Amino acid sequence: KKYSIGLDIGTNSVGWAVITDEYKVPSKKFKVLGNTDRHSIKKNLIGALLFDSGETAERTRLKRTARRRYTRRKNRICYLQEIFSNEMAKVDDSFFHRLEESFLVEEDKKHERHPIFGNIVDEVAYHEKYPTIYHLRKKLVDSTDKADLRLIYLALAHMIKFRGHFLIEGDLNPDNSDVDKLFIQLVQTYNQLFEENPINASGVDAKAILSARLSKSRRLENLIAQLPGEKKNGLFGNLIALSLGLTPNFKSNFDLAEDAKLQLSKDTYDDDLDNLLAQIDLFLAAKNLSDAILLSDILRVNTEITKAPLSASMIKRYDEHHQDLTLLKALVRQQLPEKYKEIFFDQSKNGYAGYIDGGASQEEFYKFIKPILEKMDGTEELLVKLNREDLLRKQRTFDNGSIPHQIHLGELHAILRRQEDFYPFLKDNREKIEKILTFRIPYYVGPLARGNSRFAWMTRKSEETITPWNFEEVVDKGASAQSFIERMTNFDKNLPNEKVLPKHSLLYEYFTVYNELTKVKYVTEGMRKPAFLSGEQKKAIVDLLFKTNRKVTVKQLKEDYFKKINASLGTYHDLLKIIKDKDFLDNEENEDILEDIVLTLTLFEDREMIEERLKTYAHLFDDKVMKQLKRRRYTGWGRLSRKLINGIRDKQSGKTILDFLKSDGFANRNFMQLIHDDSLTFKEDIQKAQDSLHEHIANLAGSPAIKKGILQTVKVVDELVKVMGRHKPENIVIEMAREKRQLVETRQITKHVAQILDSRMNTKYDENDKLIREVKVITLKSKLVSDFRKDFQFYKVREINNYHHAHDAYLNAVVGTALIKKYPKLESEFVYKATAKYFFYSNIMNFFKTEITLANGEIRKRPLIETNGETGEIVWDKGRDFATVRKVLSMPQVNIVKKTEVQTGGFSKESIRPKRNSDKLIARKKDWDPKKYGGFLWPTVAYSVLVVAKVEKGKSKKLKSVKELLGITIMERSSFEKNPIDFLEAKGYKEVKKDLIIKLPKYSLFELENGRKRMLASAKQLQKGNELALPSKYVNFLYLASHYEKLKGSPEDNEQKQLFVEQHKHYLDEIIEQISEFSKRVILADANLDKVLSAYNKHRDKPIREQAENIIHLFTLTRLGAPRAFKYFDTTIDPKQYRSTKEVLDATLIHQSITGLYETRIDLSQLG
RNA sequence: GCAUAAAGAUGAGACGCGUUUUAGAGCUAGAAAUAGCAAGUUAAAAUAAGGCUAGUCCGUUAUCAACUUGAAAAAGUGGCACCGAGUCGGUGCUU
DNA sequence: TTGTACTGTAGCGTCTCATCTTTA
DNA sequence: TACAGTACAA
């Protein structure tokens, strides 16, 4: 009467089985609903549920940030146009409207088709004058003429729209660092500080380290070669620590005024050089070198002194492109005149035309043109330009990601500074335009929402619209920066209402050192029995050692104190070398505000909000010591709150928990032992400190991929309980996969299972016990059932069918129950040192084996009947039990369910196809007709919809009644579910029968003649749906065959398996018969099938291993799901696609429940 | 609990490309189908259609068999034993 | 004039910062 | 892998 549910959870499957206490799987007649004639169907209680993998929220987040970036960039351009509008209205007022209209075709425009100047002659004169935008930018930076206001807008908008990265946070200016040589300036500044003035000889110094990975192995030698040496690490002769600090902190080499540990930084050189900058320079020339190295790396050499180096570099790129284009054209004319048409005219060959007008990248163009350029002569400098990747370049390439925003800011500042005198409004709000360019939302502020986002945490002081100008007096940056951290650091697991402390808390580190000092016991001459460290001894250990040094050694008790009378307190040592007062550290009277200091230096990292938090302590401290504290910075958070640390007194000892850790006398108790005890009043308070599955699924943290596996397992268990007449099982057996995103997600998809199933299943209790254990949830490791498979010839072959999930589940259930009934006293080990446990798990399994062999090559015998022994009940019966297992594995009917899903995601594929006279193109925008503008293709159908209505076909318009499938794409889903009838009537259908509309998601199952099933992949595509239930003998033979010598068993055993697979060669022809019969009944791919037969016939002489391996490959023909392309020995067999859904409109639609036991068949041929 | 690993999540702020349509007067010999030649590097705009609480916000993760109640949330709906096994069949009790 | 049947398409490279988490 | 685009076949 009782039973047990076995489960095998995966990332793409949930295998379920129901066994009774003698390992048989029962079967029941289930009621069939619907309008078909069949009223009851026999089904076995074993099966699997398949689904598509659950996806992480990553891609959605990336596209969301891209959306926000485009919105904010368009807002930047709108701010700049708002600035320009009043004066633009006085000169060519339609200008911004033409720029907005630019995308439209010639007929859709409402102004002249030429955007910039609004007529042909001025537009072509402009494009002849400035071939690129960079010519215009350099002209506006350098020339001193009053320019047309439109050109000013074009340049400023081009800098503001595409504006470079923000990684370099210093206020870099390139014009002081344009030159590649700085050696003489650095050496002059050196010897006016270090009065030597030795004989010196100049040399270029920036590029010389750019030749290699920047390191001293070049530099010490080259700098001694530059300046005649009196030192080696402090010559100030282009030493690398001036260019970039060392990544490990190291003290100053030939220091200027004070000892300080230099570091690689772009955040602290404006502060940590207070050896001078708070008391007053080599470091000026040093930072000039520091700019110079990457600036020469990212700008080409400038021999003319211009204020716009980036525009000049791009002009140089353009000019060399033009020269090499002319040269290459002439050369391929005069040497290879038949290749000229292919290179410069055919735009699909990766030539020059395919590099400009086609879609070939620079690398593809180089790879194509290298043989052409090399087989010629006179093309040598072009070849070296190609080897340096500098041949026929473009002004906007993939490697413009190195330009910092400072260079664009310099060019924009130069343009405004030149042109302010002729247009006064440009001078009146130059700062505003520079702010538009330079502004970023801080990462700790997040989206600028008004309470309508689920991603925002910002709090605003006022309620005005946030522009880049009033951002500092509308956003409470302090509170927002706080909430950026507070939303992330979780509460403690015990009292989930208080935020945890920082890990560098004095209280938390006190807790840690006292916790792992509490259970330190010393055995010595002074006592005959071991005693733990008393509170005085723990005090002495902390006070002498921890409060002076971070490392620990307990031996001071034996060597000093008894005559005299993974632990650290790092923050105490830090604050003792900063404040340098031991009193104010040991003074607990202000320890709360000391923790406030630690908390603020943990919450905040941007410097002035740290100072903002230390305004309130200005009266405690003098100015230089907050200059010392602001440089300190703490990272990481403690695991438990302050209420558990200091907000509680025990009702028996009278002590706070940290007082026990400080002093619990002898018989010391640690933190965990304290809170696990109920005689001390902690456990009941923790239980008092403590309601839906769908949140319990989430706050048990992990990716949203866990939710599918766990939740489908839970719903399977719920419906399986419902199937058995609400009678709860006595066991549930869980695969755990303990001893690869699939495996780590799988282990997360198994860890939660025992908790959720035990909490859901066992819910009734009494006054004597607060849970009556009724459903023992067993946890098993995969090794157990894997050894059970490989030890009694129950081999799995994953390629044949999806029955292996259900079979694995059944195996989990049988070995789990048969394990705990043999060893009842070991419930507390499975039911909800490493080598010893490994040997335990290795030697537990042998009780199944009739013959047991030790690690001695000798024999012992075990009886056929296994018994518990504590009570004589039989728990395994060698014989009928193996017969039962083989019978269950050989069953042909297993409930395999593909979970039907309404598809969600992108509207279509992301590439934008060119224009065509086609109706399949999806409009990019409401007014943008794709016949003129192009659009997207491959839309994704959300779910199909069976309709039955009249359509007006024939040039004689009259109503033929029709019934056909229709694909409701993700774009149309909302407009369809709003009102299906009007949407269908807009699709042309007329007199739609509203009650006959059937929503069909993906993998909707239909049954056809001969029991041939098809899964609806879309309105225009089907999938295979049946399972080849190949008998157990053939799968055993195939596993023993395809792994022919990699089996690695003991010698005589693998040899007799060798002769067995040799002796049963006819199984190959029998499996060919099985696949041919199944594929002629259900797969209906004749050409692929007789290709398979012919390829099998032509390789009958091949060895058993290779033949069997290709037979394993052969099951891709009959597999459930999409038709795939497989290969035999030689031939690659392309799939027969099921590319028409006319076939299922007269079939039996099957509505399977999650277990698949409850069905609702709808015969579609009786509709319309 | 801490130290020593690794693998993975969730969120925010930025950058550079790419694609698309338009603008950058193509010339000559010609009924031309055309053929020769010249040119090519850049810009604007969009970058899920869109939505309304109109924010420098939100729009691709998760959830979803059918049927009966329920706006929704949700709740509810399907007899058993035995002999067999080509995707489940048969026989026998029961209302 | 419209159903099969075959080869072909399919947005991606980072960077700065936060916190977590499970399994050894 | 599910559409799409050419190119047979009615």
Author numbering: 3 to 282, 288 to 572, 588 to 712, 718 to 766, 918 to 1010, 1031 to 1366
Please give sentences taken from the publication describing this entry.
Based on our kinetic data, we prepared cryo-EM samples 1 min after mixing SpRY:gRNA with NAC PAM DNA. By 13 bp of R-loop formation, REC2 and REC3 are well-resolved and stabilized by R-loop contacts.
CRISPR-Cas9 is a powerful tool for genome editing, but the strict requirement for an NGG protospacer-adjacent motif (PAM) sequence immediately next to the DNA target limits the number of editable genes. Recently developed Cas9 variants have been engineered with relaxed PAM requirements, including SpG-Cas9 (SpG) and the nearly PAM-less SpRY-Cas9 (SpRY). Here, we show that SpRY binds diverse PAM sequences by forming non-specific interactions with the phosphodiester backbone of the target DNA.
